[PDB]
């Protein structure tokens, strides 16, 4: 359940990172057994990236990918995947191209607290049309809704089984609100271009994130509402949800207009009230999925596989999604393990 504010409420008035790449299978590799080949890219900025899955020196045709999301430091991450049956001879790899790379990089395949978060990304495409807008919603480490301006439906779409229950009134409202979020970010891109005296031909990125945390008693803990321009902090709500943090003089002008209009009070009402109310509904409707704990199957490199949630403690490689709701991790040098699903 997204924020529902009027158009003029969140309108603005006034560092490239190279991707980390991981290639792996969802399950342990077994000849003749259907599996999924994954290429997890993360920690990169800007969002434009070209990812290919290679089989025996040629591109794999039907490759799907996850919806664009980003981490607390505003860097993006994506999962590229495809179904495959590995055999003895076949060799697989991932090729990644990005503005930070002088040439495409190839990586071979070596064979009870809760939260609700919404992530919004809008990237300007001068001349090539309206900005590319992608919105995703999370409950804990599970994506459940999405919106892509380039997709055909022009609707908010389900990405979890427990959200498909919701009726047309729900989807109409979320579709209406996410389109308003997009309209806000499009205007903000044009506004921010002028405030920084930037050329109309350059591509720029606007990012918005907000959500709420609850404890094991499902009572409100903390709320967030943050905003970034080109991967850098612009304006954010402080932990108390009544005052703002601005980065530079352009964001300080926005801060004053929002303080006079009492924008923080409207966001506080959503984050402390509406956000927790629908998070509780989601945790109930998806209890079989969201309230489960999956213990890590364990097997100097320490392995941990097929666990949920992603929080875990073990060269340390980033925790990665398996593509089926579970996660993976390994660490290289006794090995210490800590997870919520294991006594």
């Amino acid at each position: 359940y997204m924020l529902d504010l009027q158009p003029e409420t969140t309108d603005l008035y006034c560092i490239q990172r190279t991707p980390k790449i991981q290639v792996y299978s969802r399950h342990p590799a077994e000849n003749g057994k259907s599996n999924f080949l994954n290429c997890y890219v993360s920690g990169f900025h800007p969002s434009d990236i070209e990812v290919d899955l290679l089989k025996n020196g040629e591109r794999i045709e039907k490759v799907e990918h996850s919806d664009l999301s980003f981490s607390k430091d505003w860097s993006f991450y994506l999962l590229y995947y495809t179904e495959f049956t590995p055999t003895e001879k076949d060799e697989y790899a991932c090729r990644v191209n990005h503005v930070t790379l002088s040439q495409p990089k190839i990586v071979k395949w070596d064979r009870g607290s809760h939260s609700m978060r919404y992530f919004f990304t809008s990237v300007s495409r001068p001349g090539r049309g309206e900005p590319r807008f992608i919105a995703v919603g999370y409950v804990d480490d599970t994506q459940f809704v999405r919106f892509d301006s380039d997709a055909a439906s022009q609707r908010m779409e389900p990405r979890a089984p427990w959200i498909e229950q919701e009726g047309p009134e729900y989807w109409d409202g979320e579709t209406r609100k996410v389109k308003a979020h997009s309209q806000t970010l499009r205007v903000d891109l044009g506004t921010l271009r002028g405030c920084y005296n930037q050329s109309e031909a350059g591509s720029h990125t606007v990012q918005r994130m907000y959500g709420c945390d609850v404890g094991s008693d499902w009572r409100f803990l903390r709320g967030y509402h943050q905003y970034a321009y080109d991967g850098k902090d612009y304006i954010a709500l402080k932990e108390d949800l009544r005052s703002w943090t601005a980065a530079d003089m352009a964001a300080q002008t926005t801060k004053h207009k929002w303080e006079a209009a009492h924008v923080a009070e409207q966001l506080r009402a959503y984050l402390e009230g509406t956000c927790v109310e629908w998070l509780r509904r989601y945790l109930e409707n998806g209890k079989e999925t969201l309230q489960r704990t999956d213990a890590p199957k364990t097997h100097l490199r320490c392995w941990a596989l097929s666990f949920y949630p992603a929080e875990i403690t073990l060269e340390l490689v980033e925790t990665r999604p398996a593509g089926d709701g579970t996660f993976q991790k390994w660490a290289a040098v006794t090995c210490h393990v800590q997870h919520e699903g294991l006594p």
Epitope: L54, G57, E58, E91, P104, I106
Partner: nanobody
Amino acid sequence: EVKLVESGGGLVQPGGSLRLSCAASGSIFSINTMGWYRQKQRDLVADISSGGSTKYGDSVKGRFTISRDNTKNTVYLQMNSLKPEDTAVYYCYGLSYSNDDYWGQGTQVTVS
């Protein structure tokens, strides 16, 4: 191990054409996909597998055509309707059947 011999670049007037060629050395069982990128980063122009599966960059679709002579492990890039924005160094590349990439020195292409 693998050597990529490039040829076919140079100067051309707007609307003119050019045919790049890239020949791979070594055994024919050593290179699968062959193609071109063009110049910080380099962008995909066109490539083709041994079986003939082609892929084109968005900014050259319709104008550029890649083809292959499997009997000689050599690919050709027919560049039609060239524009000043096509001016770049075009780098030939090849992928082994174990996903090892090989890169040529590149050929400058300039459009008046």
